[PDB]
Structures are given as C-alpha cells and as structure tokens.
Structure 1
Amino acid sequence: EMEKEFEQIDKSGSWAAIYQDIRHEASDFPSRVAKLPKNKNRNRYRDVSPFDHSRIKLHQEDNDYINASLIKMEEAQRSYILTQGPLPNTVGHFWEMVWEQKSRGVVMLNRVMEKGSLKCAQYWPQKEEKEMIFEDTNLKLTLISEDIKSYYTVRQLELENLTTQETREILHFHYTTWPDFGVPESPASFLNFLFKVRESGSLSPEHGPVVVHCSAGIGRSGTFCLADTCLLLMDKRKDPSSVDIKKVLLEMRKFRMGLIQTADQLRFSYLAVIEGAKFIM
C-alpha cells in the first residue's frame, strides 16, 4: 500500500532516488516531426517535444503540427490531451485542436505571468463584449461567464466555427494558486479543483479528451492526470492497493516525455492520491 511506501520514502528521504529510477526506466520514442525546422517557432521549449506516435495532428493540409500529445489510459477509460501553454503564434492552432478533438473542457494549471516572465499567451477573452477572432483558423471565441473563487476560476466560453457557423460551449478551469516555486503545502484545494472538473462532465467519454496545460505541459499537467487516473483505478479494481503510482506514471510517460518534472511533484502526486483515497473511502 502507497500510504506505507510514502512513509518509507519520506522517513528515509529517498524522493530524489525514486524519481531518478523513473527517469531511467522511462520510454524514449522518436519526435521527428517536432524537430523539423519549420516547427521551431511552434515549440515553447526545445527539450519538450511530443512523440510522433501519440502527437495530436491538426486537420490543416499546410502544417499539421502542434506541441500536444494524446494520453490514452485503457484500463481507466480516460484520455487527456497534454499541451504546452500556447504561444502568440499558436493561439489559433490551440483552439483549432479543441474544435477538431471535440473537447468540452480546458484545464489551465499556470498563471500567464510567473516569476516575472510570460508562461503562456492570453488565449481567452477578458470581457464579454470583447470577443477574439483567430483569422488563421477561422474561429471566434466569446466569454459568456466567469466565476472567480479563491483557488480557481471557471469560465464558460462559446467557440464558433466561422466556416460552418456551428457553436460549442467550452469550460475553462483555471487553477490560479499553484505557487511560483515548489508545490502546494496541502493537496486539498487541488483535489477540490479536480472534483470540480470531474463534476462538469469534461472528463467523460461522451466528449473528446480534456485539454490540460501548464507552461511545458509535463509537470503540473502530469500531476493532474496522474492523480485523476490513479483515483479512478482505485474505484474500478477489486483491490484498490494494487494501484502502483510509479507504474501508472511510467505507462503515461509512453505517451508524453517528462511527465512529473521534480521529486517534489512526485511526492505531491502521492499525497494527492493518498488524500483523495482517504476521500470516497
């Protein structure tokens, strides 16, 4: 059981060591499309690339590339698209992907500015009466409503395909209180946020996969889909303590490199799952 595994690693301070075994065991697949010179300005970080086998393809004949990966967790019946925070030049591609994949929710785990630098383009409207038009992908985005709470904001957005005049409602779940350095002290507000995303229907199989991002789409984004998947597995299995968080992480790393960036994020993931396990129990 992971509660006991937690105490062992914690009392022995072995988090950096566990984390290095995961780094060592992790899959390595080609990412040739990401490294093409025509895609250099579609990547926020030169060392964070989608694998060719799991990459999301845009339906535009010109250049189908976006820094985004489909993570398919077969046993849990959960899919996620993990992507980087959009760049000034990829905001149109981002919304095209949301449209093409029939996503119902976008989960954002960063602030636009952190540590005095921009981590993400402002890719949604700030006011009802000032909609955004993405001329390159022929989409219009309107803010419908905004519910600001202490730890997160939920926004209802309307996405309109200007080509076909179809409209969809998108929910934007913005976790606003992840600290600039390290991880939250307590996983309580992160769990509350994760249960709010679940309650919306955004993670349900009747929609396309949820889009999850932070700045690179590997660290905080990783923690989100690791916690969700592990809790769902502990609710599906005969024996919930058969769920090994290290195994689940390695399965997710087949689909996108580098998920969980630090030993601190790994510790936090255990804590979130343990406490989320305490919940529902």
Structure 2
Amino acid sequence: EMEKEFEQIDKSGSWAAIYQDIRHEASDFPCRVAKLPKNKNRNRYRDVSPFDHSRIKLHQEDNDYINASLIKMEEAQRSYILTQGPLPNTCGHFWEMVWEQKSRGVVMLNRVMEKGSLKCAQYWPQKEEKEMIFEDTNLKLTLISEDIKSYYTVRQLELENLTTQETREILHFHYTTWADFGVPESPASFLNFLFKVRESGSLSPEHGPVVVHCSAGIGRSGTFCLADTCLLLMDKRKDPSSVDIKKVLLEMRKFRMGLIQTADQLRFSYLAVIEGAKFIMGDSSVQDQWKELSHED
C-alpha cells in the first residue's frame, strides 16, 4: 500500500535505492530506427530514443521517423504519446503526428528556454495574426486564444490539414514553472494542472492519445503520466490499495526508456497520487482546495 510504503521509504531515507532498483529492472528494447544515420538530426538527445516496437510512425513515404513513443496502458485503458520537444526541423513532423494520431491535447511541461539553453523549438504561434504553415507536412496552425495563469497557460489552437482543408481544435496545456530534473511546487499545483487537462476532455478515449512532452520527454513527462495512470487505475476499482506505483512505472518503461529521471520525481509521484486519491474516493471539495493552494491568479 503506497502510503504505508511511502513512509517506510522516507523513514530509511532510501528513495535513491528504490529509484535505482527501478532503473536496474527497467526494460531494454532496441531503438534501431532512431539510431539510423539519416535520423541523427531528428533526435534532440543522443541517449533518449524511442524503442522500435512502440515508436510512432509518421504516415509519409519518405522517412516515417519521429522521436515519440506510444505508452499504451492496457489495464488502465489509457494511452499517451511521449515525445521530445520538437526541433526546428521536426515541427512539421510533430504536428503531422498530432493530426494522424487524432490527438486533442498537447501537454508541454517545459519552457522553450531553460537554464540559458533552447530546450524546445517555438512550435506553436505566439500571436493570433501570425499563423504558422509547415510546408513539408502541409499543415497550418493558428492561435485562437490563450488563458494565462501564474504557473500554467492554456491555449486553443486550430490545426488545419491543407490537403483536405479539414480543421481541428487542439488544446495546449503549458506548465511553465516545472524545472528540468525538478518537481512541481506542490502536489496541489500539479494536481490542479492535471485535473484541468482531464477537464478539457483531451484524455478521453474517443480522442487519440494526448501528446506529452518536455525537452527529452521522459522525466517530467514520465511523472505526469505515472500520476495520471495511477489515479485512473484506482478510480476504475475505487480501491486505492490495489495500485502498485513502482509496477505501473515499470510497465510504462516497457514503452519508453527513462521515464522519471530523479528519485525525488518518483517520491513526488507518490505524493501526488496519495493526495489525488482523496478526490477519487469521494472528497470532491479537495479539487477547489488544490486550486486555492496553487495560487493560479
């Protein structure tokens, strides 16, 4: 049981050892396509690649490679696409993937510039009047509106397939204060943001998988997905004790390497899930408590 275990681990100060054990037991699968010489400029990081078996394939005849993985959580019945922050040459691929996979939301957990370096291309328009056209993939992207809060921004984008002129609404959920290799300010702040993604409909099974990224797409993205999946699992059963956080993370790591980069992110994942359990088990008022504690104004 997560809460009991949580305090056992805190008591011993053994989060590094627990986290290390998950690293040691995690799956190892080939990333042959990612390592092909022609894909070198499609990878942001040399050591972060999608497994071949779970990689997202673009629907183009030329080169179908993107650094993106489908995390298909069978028992929870939820899927996510975890991907790196697009590069200047992969922004067209990124939006092509959003289109072909029928995603409704994009969750971005990083800033474009972090610690003085460019962690992510400016892949969406910052101004209504300056829309973006990705000529390589024949897509057009327009900012429709923006709702700026203290630590996150929600954007309403319109994505158009120029070949067919069909248009779709994409919701962009942008957490702007979550540092690389860091943890959110509080369980409340993280959960307030997670429930706004859930309260967008973007995670619904009638849509394609939500796209989740930060810079590499494994650490903050892993944390976000682990908490969400764990809450969903106990929601389906209405049974918080049936959820094994470490086994869920190991299951997720069969689909993308390196999910959760630090032991404190794992520890934070426990915190977020334990706190979110109060909502799942019937205390609806906690949701407004999180919003207050998050100080989004």
TM-score of the pair, normalised by structure 1: 0.98
**1:240 corresponds to:** 240
Deviation of the 1:182 alpha carbon: 2.6
Deviation of the 1:185 alpha carbon: 3.9
Deviation of the 1:150 alpha carbon: 1.1
Q: 1:155-197 deviations in whole A, cap 9, x for unaligned? A: 0000011111110010000011113563134111110110000
The aligned runs of 1:103-252 (5 Å cut-off) are 103-179=103-179, 182-237=182-237, 239-252=239-252
- Residue 157 of structure 2 aligns to a residue whose secondary structure is strand
Give the conservation status (yes or no) of the 8 Å contact 2:181–2:220: no
Provide structure 1 residue ranges, at least 5 long, that are not aligned to the other structure: none
**2:290 corresponds to:** none
Give the conservation status (yes or no) of the 8 Å contact 2:153–2:174: yes
- Residue 82 of structure 1 aligns to a residue whose secondary structure is strand
Distance across 1 between alignment mates of 2:129 and 2:186: 38
Give the conservation status (yes or no) of the 8 Å contact 2:96–2:137: yes
**2:29 corresponds to:** 29
When the two chains are superposed, the root-mean-square deviation of aligned CA atoms in Å is: 1.0
Distance 1:115 1:138, change over 3 A: same
Deviation of the 1:151 alpha carbon: 1.8
1:89 aligns with 2:89: yes
More deviation, 237-246/248-257: 237-246
Deviation of the 1:236 alpha carbon: 1.2
Q: 1:54-111 deviations in whole A, cap 9, x for unaligned? A: 0000011000000000001111110000000000010000000000000000000001
Deviation of the 1:45 alpha carbon: 0.3
Deviation of the 1:238 alpha carbon: 5.8
Distance 1:238 1:190, change over 3 A: closer
Distance across 2 between alignment mates of 1:180 and 1:232: 26
Distance 1:146 1:238, change over 3 A: closer
TM-score of the pair, normalised by structure 2: 0.93
Distance across 1 between alignment mates of 2:119 and 2:65: 20
Distance across 1 between alignment mates of 2:181 and 2:219: 12
Deviation of the 1:125 alpha carbon: 0.4
Distance across 2 between alignment mates of 1:215 and 1:238: 34
Q: 1:195-234 deviations in whole A, cap 9, x for unaligned? A: 0001111001100000000000000000111000000111
Aligned positions, number? 281
More deviation, 22-31/238-247: 238-247
Distance 1:180 1:257, change over 3 A: closer
Distance across 2 between alignment mates of 1:122 and 1:247: 36
Give the conservation status (yes or no) of the 8 Å contact 2:19–2:263: yes
More deviation, 180-189/225-234: 180-189
Deviation of the 1:130 alpha carbon: 0.4
Distance across 1 between alignment mates of 2:179 and 2:209: 27
Deviation of the 1:240 alpha carbon: 2.4
- Residue 33 of structure 1 aligns to a residue whose secondary structure is coil
Provide structure 2 residue ranges, at least 5 long, that are not aligned to the other structure: 282-297
1:100 aligns with 2:75: no
Deviation of the 1:280 alpha carbon: 3.1
Q: 1:9-46 deviations in whole A, cap 9, x for unaligned? A: 11211000001110111010111000000000000001
Distance across 1 between alignment mates of 2:241 and 2:75: 16
- Residue 71 of structure 1 aligns to a residue whose secondary structure is strand
Distance across 2 between alignment mates of 1:187 and 1:114: 22
Distance 1:156 1:16, change over 3 A: same
Distance 1:23 1:165, change over 3 A: same
